[model samples]
Target: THSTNEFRGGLKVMVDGDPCSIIDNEFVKPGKGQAFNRVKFRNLKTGRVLERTFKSGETLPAADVVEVEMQYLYNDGEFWHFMTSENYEQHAASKEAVAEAKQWLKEEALCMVTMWNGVPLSVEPPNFV
Candidate 1:
């Protein structure tokens, strides 16, 4: 669990069972009221932005998300293949998973694959792209 005090841009949290990355966070306090955090975040799975407010001292569940660097191998008509340099393990990303990042994928290119519960949730292309 993490409190609103820990809220910051780029912080990832579990929201409604999805991993959401905080795009912006602001602390607002009225003259005689308690403080609250106004946050804007993007859903990693759906690429959608959403806003939510949390009372000060409120805690949010942390997301079980991990990003791994994988080398792009090739894509079949349906799935894209990638391999990890560390263990040479491979994963086949489904067409839906690779839909957004496919344009940046190329043989031997490096990509950051975000996984939740050992399943690929999204693929991010190299920054240079």
Candidate 2:
């Protein structure tokens, strides 16, 4: 469990049914009647920014979010496939997740696959460097 006190940049937490990383967290206490936190986050699945309000000391769930590099296979119209070199474990991603990165990725290249709870959420193209 992640608490409000631990909120910081790059901290991962589950919010709104998705895995999100905190962009920043600000606490507000005007008259000391009550305190709340304003947290900014980026969803790992959709890459969208989120703003959430939480009462002080609220606890957030930890997410199973991870990123790994794998060899790109091919897109079979329905899904894009990738496989690991050592484990040969294959992962498939949907069009919505790879559309923006499709043009930058090519066959046999390393693709950064972001996964949540064992299923892919997005694919990131490798940098030439």
Candidate 3:
């Protein structure tokens, strides 16, 4: 569990089991009401824009996530391989996990591989987008 205060622009957060990209985030407080965190985000897979507000001091469940900076190596059949920058180890991801991102990926391109509970979940394209 983590607080929404951990949020920041470009941070990836999960809501209702969907991966959401934090486009913009701000913490707001009013004189007579509870403080809140207003966030604007978009879904990577669905390409949907969303706006949400959370009460300050509220604890939000942190999605089980792991991110590794990897370089796009190659795609063979239905698997995509990404090499770790530090160890030169390769991680293979399925077409299902790397689906929509395939079009945007290129050989040797730097990317972030996001995983959840040791299961490959989503691929975050380069920030140039």
Over 4 Å off, model 2? 31-33
Largest lDDT belongs to which candidate? 1
> Candidate 3, which segments miss by more than 4 Å at Cα?
29-35, 42-47, 104-110, 124-129
Question: What is the Å distance of residue 108 in model 3 from its true position?
Answer: 4.5
Model 2 vs. true fold: TM: 0.85
Worst 10 residues of 2 by lDDT: 120-129
Clash pairs of candidate 1? Answer: none
What TM-score should be assigned to candidate 1?
A: 0.87
Local lDDT at 69 for model 2 = 86
Q: Say which prediction, candidate 1 or candidate 3, comes out ahead on TM-score.
A: 1
lDDT of each: 0.87, 0.84, 0.78
lDDT tens digits, residue span 1-129, model 3: 657878877677678777676899898889998889998987654667999898877655555666788898898868998977779878888887886778888889988887666667568778664
Q: Quote the positional error of residue 111 for candidate 3 in Å.
A: 3.5
Clash totals, every prediction = 0, 0, 0
